[PDB]
């Protein structure tokens, strides 16, 4: 195959090496990939090599049905919140993500918590039912080890209509130990009440050279800690009955990856066997279980967190500073987010539809309040050019007009208005209608002709556009694809189609 | 590792043929060019080939100095309006371009005429002075050669005083059936012919050209009627009107030849490579007078003034140059019925007229420029050019559509016109221009970001106004945007103009704004 090397001058400033066969010139992908910011690689199949080029690796969610409030939440069946490195851990006390997106301290960010919930809710609807192995009920329907100094016994508990295992072990002892031996499933679950302080510990055989790591759930409020091969999580007093549910995969990886930075250090470590459970102090223990997944317990932990942490104004105040960029006043702690409000509402509505417990709906109804107040009056409302109401992901001065957060704020209002009924849904209905009018009018401002912009800070600050990376662009499409199944407006379908095409390299026509 | 074919799947839908050497994959430029919409070619040097790649195709004008109203007009020293295929010819009557931009009929489009003038004005300031050869003054300077008239049977000629304009003049009588009276010229280098002319009766002044089409003689007849342009075989006819009063006729024989032989019924002049190589002789028919016969390399100021005079005579009572063709800007935009005004026309005309005023101090030019701001005060629906963006920023429309269109380049030309006028008119009379400019520049600074894609510019805001895809600016309009902003940046020290120019320039060599 006869070819000639040829110098290839690039915009009169750099020379790269190409190849030539008569008139056809061939450019190295090393250059193409960097210069155009595109993707490809050689893929080896049985008796066929093929280079495979992509404009992006991000992919649009394959919607299977029109959206409905009790169904999967957009594309979140495929999200995995807990592996994100901005999640420092799943809180021992609250059973939800503690995030570190903006500083290393670790704070409850409501969005991450709602997305934890929504993603698990969605996986509950799409994944295969979990295998559930029961190790201890305490009934009449063993392999505990009680060393000297310790006692164990089955006892009635009238308070909760069951039999229960009581244990007494001092902290100087080896504790009382239940052999488990699960090779496949790593979500451990048990009912727990402590009389005195103590610990429930889980020993794991890992893939790090066959070593045993132990995860201690201790009855204090201690921040996550990691020494050698011991991981410590504070689960609070548990001096009343509650179900503890812990993903040993996540809990192991977050412990070994413990960092003083805003990102968990990557680790490959996996548990390969849940060896045994170790009880110390004085207390009670029931329903000891290992499951493939515990999606509804994750969903409810998020739901209950939202109910308990909503403030008197119906907001989830965000208790860290956020500096959105030069030009934007810094957001002082206690700011609200339209994305938080909406995602929370979408979570609470789902909790209500499952349980019929009006505590969930009552929280969702209150959560519209911040939508009514401008950013400078402790709300999330912004007005674009004295004409279009908007609900801000970041209620900055000047206004920021972030697209994706806004669309989640609307999906929440849709969820609520479809669920509250005509009377009580009035406020949600009205905020939604106004918001969808704004969105239809303003969508074109986010369209570059070969991508989307993330926000309107170019217009509001007089600077370069803050273009959306491909994964945010895909989110825009997923959002509009969703809206397009609950609102029959042609504009949503047109924009979805064009925005999809951008992902495969299509451009708007030039003149 | 040896050069080998490899299949290359593109976005999981089409397979192209590339090459591979070990790990390095090489993609055909045939694909790269079309998929990313870029440019390149193999260029031949002495025993050495090189492929040359460009992200874009236009270039930014190298601005030399801060802009001022009596200087060159932006980049227009490098425009050549008359060779554009949308210029059907230079009118014999009006001495300015007749254009065919949207319909084949041919109409006087103000923008093309203003640009004709501004470009010649700018060339006057940058080109070398023209060589000027004088063939007849009719005085007593004409004792030695050139003599050179052939006055055949039936015809007469004489030098005669003309009290009307304090000079001697050549009088001619030739019937139109004769071969006419003929002055040998023989210029090989210069092709702009110029002569003062008054006709008593009908007639023609004709110019014979040796051309590069196998040495053939073509004759261009400037005839005393309003007939526009005709072409049979080797004769070209232009109507120059009665000329029964003294006037300077000035004609580019290159253009006049090429427009004639390229005469078409379509929107575009047929391309030709025919050039004149010799202006052989001038032929006078009918009864009249003839003075100051000249051939020059260029006649920039005559072109400029022809444009200026056309603008003064054709301005309407509303101070506009009405555009007399229907214009449908695109689906969603109401059709513009004839008589619509353009902010680009108004501004460019003003920039022309101000320059004419600064040169001549004839207040007719300034007063026409002052009237030309009136359409800027009136909304599109009231037969002006003003649009308002979201109840907040005044704008001056290139196309005063419903809904508003907000075309960027037209707007910036409308502002450079107002700048020229307000800098020139003085405190009292410049008030209106001052105010329209200030409001315009405030709008521009606020709205510039809406035209920035992060790797190009948008031409207009039809995407926002109609709910459709952006009308992205082709690269030559992108460089126009930069040339405009580069100019404004020398008359307004706002940092925003400097930052945008720099970023917009970087887009030309494939830089992008950062993604998040
Ligand atoms: C380990 O796991 C098991 C589940 O497998 C748990 O055992 C269950 O415990 C719950 C208590 O939380 C039991 O639910 C309660 O049942 C009580 C009586 O049920 C029987 O009798 C009634 C007549 O009253 C019959 O109708 C019924 O069919 C049963 O035969 C109820 O009194 C409780 O009602 C509560 O809710 C209502 C509102 O709905 C309140 O108004 C009441 O005041 C009251 O609070 C409740 O329904 C459940 O039956 C147990 N199941 C079994 C099979 O034992 C263990 O609790 C768990 N371990 C720990 C430590 O939590
Ligand atoms: C061929 O080319 C030659 C020049 O190359 C031309 O000859 C010149 O043409 C003009 C014709 O008008 C002569 O212009 C001079 O105008 C003076 C006043 O005119 C102005 O001011 C009055 C105000 O009352 C207005 O009415 C008028 O419209 C103008 O605004 C006259 O006064 C001149 O006459 C004498 O005065 C001047 C100084 O003021 C003396 O220096 C002169 O020598 C002269 O005696 C004169 O009319 C100009 O002088 C001509 N130049 C020469 C050298 O002859 C031809 O016109 C051109 N051929 C054709 C056919 O156009
Ligand atoms: C999505 O969430 C759904 C709702 O939470 C899940 O379906 C539910 O799955 C459970 C099965 O784990 C069913 O609960 C009961 O199961 C018992 C079996 O006895 C055991 O139960 C107790 C604990 O309560 C245990 O301690 C005992 O020792 C036993 O081992 C049945 O006998 C009951 O009748 C009852 O079925 C729910 O019924 C079931 N609900 C529904 C609506 O299906 C679903 O699996 C989740 N899916 C995913 C993919 O996560
Ligand atoms: C630009 O225009 C000016 C007209 O002012 C030209 O300068 C004149 O040239 C004529 C013809 O040779 C002379 O009669 C004058 O003496 C000149 N006037 C001045 C003020 O210099 C100039 O030649 C033109 N230049 C170009 C490149 O077109
Ligand atoms: C309870 O707390 C004390 C310190 O406050 C600690 O020393 C002790 O070991 C704890 N008890 C158990 C059973 O872990
Ligand atoms: Ca029990
Ligand atoms: Ca004379
Ligand atoms: Cl995710
Ligand atoms: Cl041009």
From Swiss-Prot, chain A:
UniProt keyword Glycoprotein present: yes
Q: What pathway is this protein a component of?
A: Glycan metabolism; heparan sulfate biosynthesis; Glycan metabolism; heparin biosynthesis
Q: What does the record say mutating residue 393 to Q does?
A: Loss of enzyme activity
Give the location in the cell. Golgi apparatus membrane
User: What is the reaction catalyzed?
Assistant: [heparosan-N-sulfate](n) = [heparan-N-sulfate](n)
Q: Which GO terms describe its biological process?
A: heparan sulfate proteoglycan biosynthetic process; heparin proteoglycan biosynthetic process; negative regulation of cell projection organization; positive regulation of cell population proliferation; positive regulation of SMAD protein signal transduction
Carbohydrate attachment residues:
124, 197, 287
A single GO molecular-function term is: racemase and epimerase activity, acting on carbohydrates and derivatives
Instruction: Please state the Enzyme Commission number of this protein.
Output: 5.1.3.17
Q: Does the keyword Calcium apply?
A: yes
Residues bound to substrate are 79, 84-86, 101, 109, 112, 115, 323-326, 393-394, 404, 408, 454, 457, 466-475
Q: Which residues bind Ca(2+)?
A: 137, 139, 162-163, 286
Explain what the record says happens when changing residue 109 to A: Reduces enzyme activity by about 30%
Which family is annotated? Belongs to the D-glucuronyl C5-epimerase family.
Q: What does this protein do?
A: Converts D-glucuronic acid residues adjacent to N-sulfate sugar residues to L-iduronic acid residues, both in maturing heparan sulfate (HS) and heparin chains. This is important for further modifications that determine the specificity of interactions between these glycosaminoglycans and proteins.
What is the protein's name according to its record? D-glucuronyl C5-epimerase
């Amino acid at each position: 195959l006869k070819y000639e090397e040829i110098d290839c001058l690039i915009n009169d400033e750099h020379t790269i090496k190409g190849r030539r066969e008569g008139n056809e010139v061939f450019l190295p992908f090393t250059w193409v990939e960097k210069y155009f910011d595109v993707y490809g690689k050689v893929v080896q199949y049985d008796g066929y090599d093929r280079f495979e080029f992509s404009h992006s690796y991000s992919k649009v969610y394959a919607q299977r049905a029109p959206y409905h409030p009790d169904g999967v939440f957009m594309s979140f069946e495929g999200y995995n919140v807990e592996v994100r490195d901005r999640v420092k851990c799943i809180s021992g006390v609250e059973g939800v993500p503690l995030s570190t997106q903006w500083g290393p301290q670790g704070y409850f960010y409501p969005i991450q918590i709602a997305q934890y919930g929504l993603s698990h809710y969605s996986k509950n609807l799409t994944e295969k039912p979990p295998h559930i192995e029961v190790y201890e009920t305490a009934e009449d329907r063993n392999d505990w080890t009680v060393p000297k100094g310790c006692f164990m016994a089955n006892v009635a508990d009238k308070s909760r209509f069951t039999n229960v295992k009581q244990f007494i072990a001092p902290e100087t002892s080896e504790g009382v130990s239940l052999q488990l031996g699960n090779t496949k499933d790593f979500i451990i679950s048990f009912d727990l009440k402590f009389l005195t302080n103590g610990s429930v510990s889980v020993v794991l055989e890992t893939t790090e050279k066959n070593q045993l790591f132990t995860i201690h759930y201790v009855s204090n409020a201690q921040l996550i800690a990691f020494k050698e091969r011991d991981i410590y999580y504070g689960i609070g007093p548990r001096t009343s009955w509650s179900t503890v549910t812990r993903d040993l995969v996540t809990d192991l990886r977050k412990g070994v990856g413990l960092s003083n930075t805003k990102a968990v250090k990557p680790t490959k470590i996996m548990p390969k066997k849940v060896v045994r459970l170790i009880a110390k102090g004085k207390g009670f223990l029931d329903n000891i279980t290992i499951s493939t997944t515990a999606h509804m317990a994750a969903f409810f932990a998020a739901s209950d967190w939202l109910v308990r942490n909503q403030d008197e104004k119906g907001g989830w105040p965000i208790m860290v500073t956020r500096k959105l960029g030069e030009g934007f006043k810094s957001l002082e702690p206690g700011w609200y987010s339209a994305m938080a409000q909406g995602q929370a509402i979408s979570t609470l509505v789902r909790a209500y539809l499952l349980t019929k417990d009006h505590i969930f709906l009552n929280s969702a109804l209150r959560a519209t309040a911040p939508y009514k107040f401008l950013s400078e009056q402790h709300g999330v409302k912004a007005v674009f050019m004295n004409k279009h109401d908007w609900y801000e992901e970041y209620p900055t001065t000047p206004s920021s007009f972030v697209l994706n957060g806004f669309m989640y704020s609307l999906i929440g209002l849709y969820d609520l208005k479809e669920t509250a009924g005509e009377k009580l849904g009035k406020e949600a209905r009205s905020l939604y209608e106004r918001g969808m009018e704004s969105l239809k009018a303003m969508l074109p401002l986010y369209d570059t002709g070969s991508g989307t912009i993330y926000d309107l800070r170019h217009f509001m600050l007089g600077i370069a556009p803050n273009l959306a990376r491909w994964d945010y662009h895909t989110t825009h499409i997923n959002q509009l694809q969703l809206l397009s199944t609950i609102d029959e407006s042609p504009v949503f379908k047109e924009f979805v189609k064009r925005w999809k095409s951008y992902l495969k390299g299509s451009r708007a026509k030039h003149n």
